[model samples]
Target: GANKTVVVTTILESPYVMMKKNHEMLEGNERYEGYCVDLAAEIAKHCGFKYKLTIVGDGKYGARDADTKIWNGMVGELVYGKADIAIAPLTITLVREEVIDFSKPFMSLGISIMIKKGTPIESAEDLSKQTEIAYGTLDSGSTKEFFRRSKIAVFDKMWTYMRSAEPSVFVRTTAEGVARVRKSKGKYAYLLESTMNEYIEQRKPCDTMKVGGNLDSKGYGIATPKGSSLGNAVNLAVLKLNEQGLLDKLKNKWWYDKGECG
Candidate 1:
């Protein structure tokens, strides 16, 4: 196959890979716009290749099913040879690293607390101690896994609460978690990545806010199947972009510059 279009598996997360407002009338990659959309173009140009952005069918960041032993999400696509690479806000973790290759950090983020405006909670500690405000993380994401595996007293206690919460606090999507926070009348809070938490705060109907410091620090990376031909070039491109300030500029372009809240 000569010059086959590189299949890029990504997700439709806000400010990362959102459907353009006019998407219904557009085609291919023209139907989407976001930070990752911009980043994909920059990376492809630097690496000198053609790419087609395809959203991950499962809408996950990749998780292993314990019994079935199968990977799902962008990671799954790469593992199954359905895509050549993934250029989304996929986190870098030990488990994911074992199965795939990741470029140097393109974006740094950490687990953060999101609360409805005027909520009394000020920190993770505050939420950990109170049962009145039910808080949870997105199911099957790093945030939930963080709590599940933490030996830290505060986070462990919070996880215990979340796991047993009668109404099931775990949300399938970040949007759903946010919806719970907005409509729960301050009775619910969400734990998500700081990058996303901050992005939502700048959006319209500015009724949500990130509270306290991040629980942990980590970076997101572009991913490829283990030992892919494109790994080296993609890694170098990310470092080059970061050093040249292109990454920072992209952050500003998609975030604050277009902020809906004054």
Candidate 2:
């Protein structure tokens, strides 16, 4: 297996992993570009291995299937050995850590609400107080899972309302939630990652703004199957990338400088 190509499974998220507009003009690793692309290359260099970057078959990030007790997306790919590594914005949660190993967090972020500029809601607390401004999150992912498991005062109250609300405001994807906000005309709010919220803020029509501070703190890590030999090397590689300023550079490159989202 020494010469075997290590497959790195990633998701297609903006400002993270995107195919080049002129992808046919590029070759090899250069075909893919974004923050994760840069970080994964540095990790490959440090670990002394070559990898083929492949997008996850399903666009969904990792999530638990309550009925089957299975994981999906990049995490599922790693769990099922469809790939050897994942460098997506794969969040580190207590449930996931027990099954797979993760590198030190390459970036830290929290959940925020994206609302149209004139929306009545200003904070998570305001969300609980208003019945007219409907809000929800991506179902079965980190943000909803956070609310489901939270013991915090404000979030606990929010969960009470979301769980019982009719028409089930849950969205299956971040884009769907953002679309709802864009079309809501001040009647809806979408809760998603701060990184994503900021990304949307810079896009066309530019009516959405991230309102309220982040509700929870979490970090994203590069994940591998449990007991994989690659964990330590990749972990150290992430740290090196951070210390050398490459990580910060990548963040600004995708999120601030070179992306249409900006």
Candidate 3:
């Protein structure tokens, strides 16, 4: 058999793919650390391949340009052959599934609102009806797109507001959204994956809290290009990790062992 090297595409979300504090002394792949880094290491071991971890070029999770017909973000890397696979906290969506293959979900999550600790926001519907607090999703992920195309009454109304809101409530990164929530002092609410909301709540300052229930239910999956030879093997590996309780262990290790809240 021929030896193969995998080029992995990921993002810089904390507790997922984050820079190690000692990254200044580390080289190349060793510079980054987090749950995704550990997961990628285990994946390489089970799949038996060498790999290089790199960030997504466009600094996005992935979204298709309606006019240009081009894909951007980690998903784009696989679709365009720039990376062999993706092992990040990438959400699995129907639109993305058409262009890429996802291993069985390794984690479950959903969209949630991150609000300042003492804020009045408690639900999407509550936020939708109020003008006192500005709320929006990360600019490009499926979360934003979901609201943009939704048929439900509350969601449709939200999309109408966000689609053309002046001053733009959308944020470019998770950190920016979280920072906005904390700095806004109860003026802005950031919508993001529940796992991320939960993770942020357990961190320092902890001024922001996840108030409302999730807007939708979903899971994060490892991604590969459509028809990839490694798809079946990766799928099996995820199932194996689930069966062995490793997945749950990893979640606790990152989300709780280091949790900063009571």
Candidate 4:
């Protein structure tokens, strides 16, 4: 409990935790940089603790194996006592909350639509009504799960199309979905979280655009093992950072200030 270095579990995603080009010459946290990296630093500083960031092993957000009942990804690391906390773009969900404690949302986001620039689609309804543009989300993320589980008429209809599409609309990763959008020449659209959608819009190529309002609202929070003492301090630290506007500043710095798109 005294002078212990906190082990932090996170995932590598664009504009979040990316390796520096010079990472081979660097060490520890210095080898990586991004919005979440910056946020992790601020949280540690505010909470007066030392920490080490480690990438999640399975490269997943978090999920439980149904049959084996074993945990995997960052959440598993926490549940198994391997990591002291998780500070990344991991979303706060009811199931995860049942197993771990989440700080107040550090960043708010929602499911959004990503269409290649100049596409006719203006909303999910537009996509739902058309067959020319094949749209889908990452295979294993919240967006796909939302569609699969939603009972709303429009979304359910969209999910029906996506579920039975001949060519398989789903992709395994965000980059795969984005690449499909770019290469399909307006024939494909990607559904993803808004924060990631916004980040990709600012990257080079600039061929994609987010249209319509978000489909659903959610937030990302720092995660701690259930009943851990560090949970309270980290939770309060997130609130303090938001109140001080540091979260907003960090977002601007990483997203727009370093943006490649004009």
lDDT of candidate 1 over 164-258, digit per residue (tens): 99889999998999999999999999999999999999998999999999999999999999999899999999999999999999999998998
Cα lDDT tens digits for candidate 3, 143-233? 8978987999888888898888878999988889988898898999888999999999999997888886888889999999999998999
Give me the runs in candidate 1 sitting further than 4 Å from their true place.
Answer: none
Q: In angstroms, how far off is 111's CA in candidate 2?
A: 1.2
lDDT of 2 at 125: 90
lDDT of 2 by residue, 1-262 (tens): 5567789999888778889899999887678888888888888988898899998998878876989988888888988888999999988998889889999999989999999988878899999877898889888788888898889888888898898888888998777898899898988889899988988788777788998788888999999999998898899999988999888888887777743544
Q: Would you estimate the TM-scores of all the predictions?
A: 0.98, 0.94, 0.96, 0.96
TM-score of 2: 0.94
| Candidate 4 structure, TM-score to reference | 0.96
Candidate 2 C-alpha error for residue 143, in Å: 1.0
Which pairs in model 1 have colliding backbones?
none
Q: Model 2, stretches more than 4 Å misplaced?
A: 24-28, 259-262
Winner on lDDT between 2 and 3 is: 3
Judging by lDDT against the true structure, name the best candidate: 1
**After best superposition, candidate 2 residue 186: deviation in angstroms?**
1.3
* lDDT (0 to 1) per candidate: 0.94, 0.87, 0.89, 0.93
Error of 4 at 17 (Å): 0.8
- CA RMSD of all predictions: 0.9, 1.8, 1.3, 1.2
Clashing pairs in 3: none
Specify the poorest-scoring 10-residue window by lDDT in model 1: 136-145
Candidate 4: worst-modelled 10 consecutive residues by lDDT: 136-145
Count clashes in each candidate, considering only residues at least 3 apart in sequence or on different chains.
0, 0, 0, 0
